[model samples]
Target chain A: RPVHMQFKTCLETSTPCTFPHAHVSLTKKQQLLMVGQAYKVIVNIDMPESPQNLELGMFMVCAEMRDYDSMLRGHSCRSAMMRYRSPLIRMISTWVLSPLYVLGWKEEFQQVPVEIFSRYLEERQHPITDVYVEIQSQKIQFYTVTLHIVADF
Target chain B: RPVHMQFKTCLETSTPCTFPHAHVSLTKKQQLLMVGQAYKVIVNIDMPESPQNLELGMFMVCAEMRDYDSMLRGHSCRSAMMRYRSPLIRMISTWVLSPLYVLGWKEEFQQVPVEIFSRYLEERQHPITDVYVEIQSQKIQFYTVTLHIVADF
Candidate 1:
């Protein structure tokens, strides 16, 4: 469900939060991973308990990277498609991420429990590349609520 | 060694620093990473040459986290340590991180190659805890740096 935790806040000036599924690291906060590599960015988001929040919608999650010169520049990605009503956005999304509708690179952002995106969260499959700038400075993010509404019939 | 690239200015502005390894993501800019649970923030860092900057000393790095409720509350982290002579601090670091003269949670920051910290570098593994408010808002950053002087003898 919602990270299977004890409270709304775990490490809230009390004690450090712990997770069994995460890769425990002792590294710094502003560092870069090697290119051709994959890693996770763990952090909380500002998802308040909004009543208008959808119960079931697509969650678009993805990452992009630039070089340090870009502090100078940066990245992000998403991986869910809202229930669609678009003629062209759908076609184009399908063009790169889908295969005969089975979906490939034309990967459609899928439906997920809205609450899952609300509280404690972790992004585990971000792939690193050369176009990377500042790892911590760059962007690796996700969104679904607003887009699903925009695409709604 | 450094991030096998050429020159200091890449996407920083005009140059295109190409690494053969990353996934090269070209998505949007702003997004979100979930929190409470831990994850990895990965990318390649800038390890460029320094202008004979060090007089040969030490470095120290450490991390401190806070949460967002505090956005007015925010936070960040780094792990590169420059040389120092603070016996008390060294003892403190070793106290928590030492197992067999080994560093644990009582980890002591260490000195590293100057290039590793130079070039407006970045992060590889920065675990997000409650010291976090929101990745979309707060920062959990880390960096490696070398200096010619430690805080102690």
Candidate 2:
């Protein structure tokens, strides 16, 4: 059964809202970012009331642009996917990473790829409207929130 | 004996000039960057006619601000150091990385740390004038070039 959970965009840090699993921060109050420039987003997952035996294999945080489906179709092999399976005290929080689908886990935070970004700078005449983050685990799709990232040249 | 090397800022990508070790590109012809925003620089080290047996252990790429000396003292523990010991065909080229000195190497490129960048955004009113990259290796301290990065809000 699909749960009708209380949700708001993690962009609002001051809002006292309780999410099902975690809270995320885009670091800066960035709604608009230069297309080819690198940017960071942080995911903080802490569920104290979560089941003791609720084990997740991995959490795939994928960033997808709104209207750039044609450009992103070929990039499916190595798109903007941040795979975090690390840990903390009663929490499983990590820095979600870049647009390129590199398959190694890093303690370091990742940014959007220049190759993907520069392509926009080089090819496109208009700005990319919306880029959102979709979080998925083995069992549940935790949060799929619009980052509201306007990619401009 | 100090070798009087002919060098200029890598900021100019079009000038027909030969560097001692390699050429670097800061990507977007960027002179000024947003303080807390992340940026990338690519280093290309290709010495084809050099000695074949000249084995180098590691190359450290560092990013230092022109006038922010006092702020950088304590940060020496893990400052803006990108350590690349990887390779390519007849070349040893890699992407340099971020500021808040973490000690693991990666095949993926790195950006300037948010901790370091955000501090500038939070603390300073004036823009940082020059942020240059200094490349050092097992034997020689390769090209030391200014990346004219003026950091502002």
Candidate 3:
């Protein structure tokens, strides 16, 4: 299973700024997720200087599983439309994904089937899995962040 | 307003196969479409040898307006997920789009606002406009067709 993601940060401001602070976290303890079980990817956003009724067209969530030697084992990706109705909006968004979600793209997401998820599971002893969230308009990315999904199994 | 589309035909069968017979037509008369009014894109498909439960992931509908010199004036693009439950399925699918739908991409399509559509209108005398329908899986396209949408005013 292969997933393609572009990590590019584009800040279009003159003055020094850190307006939209974003981060990603997992629901399971220590970020340890199983192959067949569904898990939530939590995306936190704190935009203090954002304009009211701001709409972000492309909000993407992706995951990658790799071995210590940097060999890819599995991947999954999903995207949705986001809207912020108020300034200084602190929001928390969550999407469920599993190895079965690999190669699947949609606006509303759901857990992948166990048969599909197990196909992408890494058979090695220990593999590093990470998840990332990116907000973008067209090609210009406004904010992005990555975190270890499952340090190891 | 401008739109980009790729018209590439890919048929993988060898035995004089006419599997996915596809074509595109509009609902308006003489193929004359107004800038603001919503219209339906009629996609006709007659697939006989298609396997049971054929799922087409990327079904795209797009439009473009141009001048006599082949100068781009306006464009719109939209996509959806199409599924066929049985073989020899004669399907007639329709999606509504207008000039306002330019640069908009989604799975569930809707009409664009007059404000956005008017922005991409061609303010010239006797311009040419056309629309196309395409069915693809990732990079490998299955079927595609184009027809003159609005001949000229």
Candidate 4:
């Protein structure tokens, strides 16, 4: 049995601004929310797979700041004579053998509520200003609406 | 020094599609990309405060959610009531705070590269189809795009 879920986001403002809105939806069998801010958003879902078919239809969406184009337009002015540095050699010698540290380690995933998650962040000295979640039927939706300053004197 | 972060979401399309664009930014510091089919969003910031202030903020958020107009409207229907049964309090109480079982406890927070986060989801059997991360200076960003569905469909 597969469960279906729907997600959406709406932005409202009195005056027009550079960045305005965002919305997203996913298939009816995945469970996770990835919200990005100063720190990145990481979500993991565990499910059963059918080996014979091996076809997983999944996708990701990316929304970037409008100013990113202008902000990243410049290149490093390092002299061309500077040698390119590569970590390939280090990867083979050190990282290749690092698995010894996790030889007997076990991993588990725990489902946590948004309140508990918020408490964890608070304990780590992170403060949240706003929070939102929309639940319809068996579906749980997540959203965060933030105030932005386009320009400051 | 304390750092501040902000988040924003972008509607990448208008075609009733799955997956939406979301972005997060820190106070003059970093940017993160979040990929999720979000039906809701939550943003919490940690500010230096006494124990009382922390508790006050947490309680306020919880109360606000309970009384929120949107939540009330969504949960007011008879169909929603049939599906919504508050979990037994005693069952939840014994799960997190006792010697019901002996288990090893480990710290959950650690710095991991963005790519590893995405790759782990891809290798899992769940409905997660994609994950990504963006890094800037000392902060790490994470994003996940998943198939959205109800929990017990």
Candidate 5:
């Protein structure tokens, strides 16, 4: 049986037009839901009357990035992967920069090690990442979103 | 009685010139020598026998500046004062500056507590004083020099 439900936007924003669009679909399988065939939902609501917000927010749902495959192949993602291949870049920048900065005053410029500059550039380019999630759902539908956050060096 | 020593001058360089002179004297009291008056000693050495390659190097001897008055006041003799103050500077500078210069990259420019810097400076300025003497037929000679050295920051 299918149920009909009214949905409202729980996101507090000044503009009603700024609401995200809801993508919806369904899936059934003998053992497990098929990829891409499983429910993909994005919902947009004008106000509090939408019931989808309460139901979706309370339940645990499996999430997959909408563009995970594309991201895996993308240049930025590849760069992130390549950069993180060596963890020393992070360690050295935090540990070595201040001393080298000071020693640069005493020693010849050529004596400054390449690792120091490399680590500094690595930290400058990548910084660190923070992840956040947002969800929107009605009594009958649901949506999931993932945010990738980075800090400036 | 003072013994005079002289050497022949082979090259004509310069005439007798006076430079700032300082010395600490020593006196013997009941088989114990006490530091005596510290008088600025001014003597000119003939250059003929002096090494032609002599180079003037700027050396700073720092003592706890606070002790300047006490050191000057406590010792009355020039030889004794010289015995007390000369080597301290060389020992402190070599012991302190050598390690610091070697480890310059790791520690020197680091963020150090202000108290540590003050303490280090103080320790470096403290003098090492121990005297040993020998006498030969109405002549007193110093076998070892005690140093109280200070460096200008």
Candidate 6:
């Protein structure tokens, strides 16, 4: 289970913003999934945003598993592309993770996570309001909602 | 703006399977989104499976953008991390992608759908049943109508 996600948000008026809204529901049979049954979902997110911003930062994706429990209990997933930016960063990551990947150990995600060990789940959860999003901007002013562009789906 | 989502599904013998059930409503503002506006959505996916038989293979995620089209235009996301189980494989990915990251460029993902960048979509657009999942197993028999996992959202 190698599921990785990249989250990015901005406050620059000149900079366009992208917001992802999605949902999932487990079916009867699906809820009963287990190992050997082998479940897999691969999603790759590319936030390749304002590289010019220099203030490039980080954000979060929290999970609310209805009966959702610890990673070891069942399904697991996460990704690692967000931090792969430049040669310097690459050298650092490779320097740090080379032995790990080579030896077959994957990095863990904090949330909305990914992993290779999985089992069917019993869940009927939805996204909650306390969305965990983080961004860094020199123009940061917690004062304005400014202009909002909603994308209908 | 924040876009958040989580996916869930399962399979078991005791309880009959009910696939993933899901639904969503585009906010009024989201529906009114216009061009020149920028938005990005990030999702972390997990695919924990038992790597037993050895012949584990490839699969794809296909997307029909309702009214939207062309990964080249915008909103295209994909990830591939099939376990080749080799230090050599690790050596190659680390070697090749490291510098690219240092230079700053994301390998593009063709859509089974969208990631972040998006447009107001129509309800008429629904998930096509032709799922692009590829897996190789000693249990690989196209003969079994056995277990077909579908997430209904």
lDDT of each: 0.24, 0.29, 0.31, 0.21, 0.21, 0.29
Best by lDDT: 3
Q: Candidate 4: where are CA atoms >4 Å away?
A: A1-111, A115-133, A136-153, B1-16, B29-112, B115-153
Residue runs of model 3 more than 4 Å from their true location after superposition: A1-49, A52-55, A59-63, A84-121, A132-153, B1-153
Write model 5 residue lDDT over A1-153, tens digit each, in one string: 121122234345534333333223122221021122222222122222123322121111111222212221111110000001012222334254557656664231111100000011112222212111122122323222222111111
After superposition on all C-alphas, the RMSD of every candidate to the true structure, in Å, is 24.7, 19.4, 20.8, 25.0, 33.7, 21.1
lDDT of 3 by residue, B9-113 (tens): 222221223322222223333323443433323223222111211333344444455544556666665454444333222221211322122222322222221
* lDDT accuracy of residue B147 in candidate 6: 17
Query: What are the per-model DockQ values?
Result: 0.01, 0.01, 0.03, 0.02, 0.01, 0.03
Clashes of each: 71, 4, 2, 26, 31, 52
Between prediction 3 and prediction 5, the one with superior DockQ is 3
Better of 4 and 6 by TM-score: 6
**What are the per-residue Cα lDDT tens digits for candidate 4 across B35-140?**
1221222223222111222232211111011111122211111110011222364235324532322222311112211111111111111222211111111111
Docking class of 6: incorrect
Q: What is the TM-score of chain B in candidate 5?
A: 0.15
lDDT of 4 by residue, A1-153 (tens): 122222333233333222223323232111111122222222222222222111211212222211112232111110000011112322332344456535733222122211102111121222322222221111111232221211111
Leading candidate by TM-score: 3
Candidate 6, position B75, lDDT: 29
Task: Identify the runs in model 5 with alpha carbons over 4 angstroms from their true place.
Answer: A1-52, A55-57, A65-153, B1-153
Task: Please provide, for model 5 over B39-67, each residue's C-alpha lDDT reduced to its tens digit, 9 standing for 90 to 100.
Answer: 11111221110111112222122211122
**lDDT of each residue in B35-126, candidate 2, tens digit only:** 34533222233232223212322123434444333243211111112222112211212222322124544333333221223234222333
Q: What's the lDDT of the predicted structure labeled candidate 3?
A: 0.31
